[PDB]
Design a binder for this molecule. Structure first.
Ligand code: HEM
Ligand code: FJQ
Length: 451
C-alpha cells in the first residue's frame, strides 16, 4: 500500500539523483532497489515509475490512462510544436494529423519505400566494402548516416548525402547544439552574446532545411507520393481539411528526428549484441546468406528474415531506444489493487526494466537470446512495449523495423565482423540511447552488389 520513494534532499526532493548524464540508467538502478513502483518527486512535481508487467498492463488501459506530456515532452514542444509526438490526445491537431499521416506508414506505403531504403542501404555496404585493411567502422555514426538519409529520401525525397560527409549533416549538429543551448539557457550576460547566436544560426539552419524541403516539392514536376505528399495535400477524413502551414512545419521537423535517431540506436545495439554473442551472429548470418539470394534485397525477401527480426526485438528488449513514455490518470483509480491514484497523476513506464521482469522472461533476462521471440503468442500482453501503447503508439514502427531488418540482413550477408577492441558497453543518453564509441572491423565476404 505504502509507496516506496528514494532519497530526499530537502527542497530539491529527488532530483540530484538525476544529476547525471545517464538518468535512465540511474532510474533503472533505483528500480532494482525499490521494485516495481516508486514515487519520484521534484519541486512541484510527482512521478510514479512503473517497472513490472503486472502494473504496466493496467497503465496501458486507455479507458483509465491517457498519454501524458511529461516535462521532457513539454520542454521539446518549443521545437516540435503540436506535431504528432508532442500533442495531447484530445488536441485537435493530434487526431487530424494522425488521420492524415496514417496511410503513409501502412504495409503498402512500405512497399513503395523499399527501393529508396535499398538505395541508402547499398551506400552503407559500399562504404564498408571500400575501407582499407585495418581501418575500422564507427558503428552508431554510420548507422545515423543511414537512418537520417533514409527518412530524408523516403519521407521527403531530400538527399542528406550523409555518406558524402566526414562529419554529421549540419542539420543534425545545429539541432543537437540548439537543444542543449535551450537546456543551459534555463540557468543575460556579456559572454552569452556568442551563445544566443549559435542559437539563432542553428534555428536558421533548420528553418532553411524545412523551407527547402517544401520548396523543392512545390517546384518539382513530381512523380511523388510519400510522407511529404500527404502532409501538404492529405485531407482529414473527419473535417475534410488539410493540415495548416504551421503544423506541417512541426510535422516535418518531428519526422526528420523521430524517423532516424531511435532506429540508429537499434541497429547499433543489435550489432553490439551480435558481436558479443558469436553463436547468434553465425545463426543470423546463415539466414541472411540463405534468404538474400539477389544482388539487392526485395521487399518479400526482407519479410522472410525471421531470425534477423528476432535479433532486432531482443535488442529492443534489452535496450529500447525510446526507453520511457508517460501516462496520466483520467480519473481517480487504484493501481494494482494497492496504490490509489488521483485524477491527473503521472505514471512513467520504464521500458528497460519492464523488459527485465523475471516473472515474464525468466531468470536469464540479461542474456541475449533472440529465440525468446520464436512464438509471439507466448509473449504476454503488454510485456514488450518498445513502441509505446494504444492509439499513441509509434506510427513509424513498421518503417523502423523494415529498414533495420533490410540493413542488418545486408550487413550480415556481406561482412564478417570483429570486435577488435573488445568494446566495453557505454550507453550515451540523448533523446535516444546508443552504444557510444562502439567500433568494429568488417572483413568483406566479396559478394557483389546490384544496380
Ligand atoms: C526502433 C525505433 C523506434 C522506437 C523504439 C520508437 C518508439 C516510440 C515510442 C515508445 C513512442 C511513444 C512515445 C510516447 O508515448 O510518448 C513513439 C511514438 C512515435 N514515433 Fe516512434 N519509435 C521508433 C521509430 C520511429 C520512426 C522510424 C518514426 C517515423 C518515421 C517514428 C515516429 C513516431 C511518432 C510520430 C510518434 C508519435 C505517434 C503519435 O502519438 O501519434 N518512430 N515511438
Ligand atoms: Cl522524453 C522523450 C525523448 C525522446 C522521445 C522521442 C522518441 N521517439 C523517437 C521516435 N519515436 C519515438 O524522440 C524525440 C522526438 C523526435 C521527434 S519529436 C520528439 Cl519528442 C520522446 Cl517521445 C520522449
Amino acid at each position: 500500500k505504502e509507496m516506496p520513494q528514494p532519497k530526499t534532499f530537502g527542497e530539491l526532493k529527488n532530483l540530484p539523483l538525476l544529476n547525471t548524464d545517464k538518468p535512465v540508467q540511474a532510474l533503472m538502478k533505483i528500480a532494482d532497489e525499490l521494485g516495481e513502483i516508486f514515487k519520484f518527486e521534484a519541486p512541484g512535481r510527482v512521478t510514479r515509475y512503473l517497472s513490472s508487467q503486472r502494473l504496466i498492463k493496467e497503465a496501458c488501459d486507455e479507458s483509465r490512462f491517457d498519454k501524458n506530456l511529461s516535462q521532457a515532452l513539454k520542454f521539446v514542444r518549443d521545437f516540435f510544436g503540436d506535431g504528432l509526438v508532442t500533442s495531447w490526445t484530445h488536441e485537435k491537431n493530434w487526431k487530424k494529423a494522425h488521420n492524415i499521416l496514417l496511410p503513409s506508414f501502412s504495409q503498402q506505403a512500405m512497399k513503395g519505400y523499399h527501393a529508396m531504403m535499398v538505395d541508402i542501404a547499398v551506400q552503407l555496404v559500399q562504404k564498408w566494402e571500400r575501407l582499407n585493411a585495418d581501418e575500422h567502422i564507427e558503428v552508431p555514426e554510420d548507422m545515423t548516416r543511414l537512418t537520417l538519409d533514409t527518412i530524408g529520401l523516403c519521407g521527403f525525397n531530400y538527399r542528406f548525402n550523409s555518406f558524402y560527409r566526414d562529419q554529421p549533416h549540419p542539420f543534425i549538429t545545429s539541432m543537437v547544439r540548439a537543444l542543449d543551448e535551450a537546456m543551459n539557457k534555463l540557468q543575460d550576460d556579456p559572454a552569452y552574446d556568442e551563445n544566443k547566436r549559435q542559437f539563432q544560426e542553428d534555428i536558421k539552419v533548420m528553418n532553411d532545411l524545412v523551407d527547402k524541403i517544401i520548396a523543392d516539392r512545390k517546384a518539382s514536376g513530381e512523380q511523388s507520393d510519400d510522407l511529404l505528399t500527404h502532409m501538404l495535400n492529405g485531407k482529414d477524413p473527419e473535417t475534410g481539411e488539410p493540415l495548416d502551414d504551421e503544423n506541417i512545419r512541426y510535422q516535418i521537423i518531428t519526422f526528420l528526428i523521430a524517423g532516424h535517431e531511435t532506429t540508429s540506436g537499434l541497429l547499433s545495439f543489435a550489432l553490439y549484441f551480435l558481436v558479443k554473442n558469436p553463436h547468434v551472429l553465425q545463426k543470423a548470418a546463415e539466414e541472411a546468406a540463405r534468404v538474400l539470394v539477389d544482388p539487392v534485397p526485395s521487399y518479400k525477401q526482407v519479410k522472410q528474415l525471421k531470425y534477423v527480426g528476432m535479433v532486432l526485438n531482443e535488442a529492443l528488449r534489452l535496450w529500447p531506444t525510446a526507453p520511457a513514455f508517460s501516462l496520466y490518470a483520467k480519473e481517480d483509480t487504484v493501481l494494482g489493487g494497492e496504490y490509489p491514484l488521483e485524477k491527473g497523476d503521472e505514471l512513467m513506464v520504464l521500458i528497460p526494466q519492464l523488459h527485465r521482469d523475471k516473472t515474464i522472461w525468466g531468470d536469464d533476462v540479461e542474456e541475449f537470446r533472440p529465440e525468446r521471440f520464436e512464438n509471439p503468442s507466448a509473449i504476454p500482453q503488454h510485456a514488450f512495449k518498445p513502441f509505446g501503447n494504444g492509439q499513441r503508439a509509434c506510427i513509424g514502427q513498421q518503417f523502423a523495423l523494415h529498414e533495420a531488418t533490410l540493413v542488418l540482413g545486408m550487413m550480415l550477408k556481406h561482412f564478417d565482423f570483429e570486435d577488435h577492441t573488445n568494446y566495453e558497453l557505454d550507453i550515451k543518453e540523448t533523446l535516444t540511447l546508443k552504444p557510444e564509441g562502439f567500433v568494429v572491423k568488417a572483413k568483406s565476404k566479396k559478394i557483389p552488389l546490384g544496380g
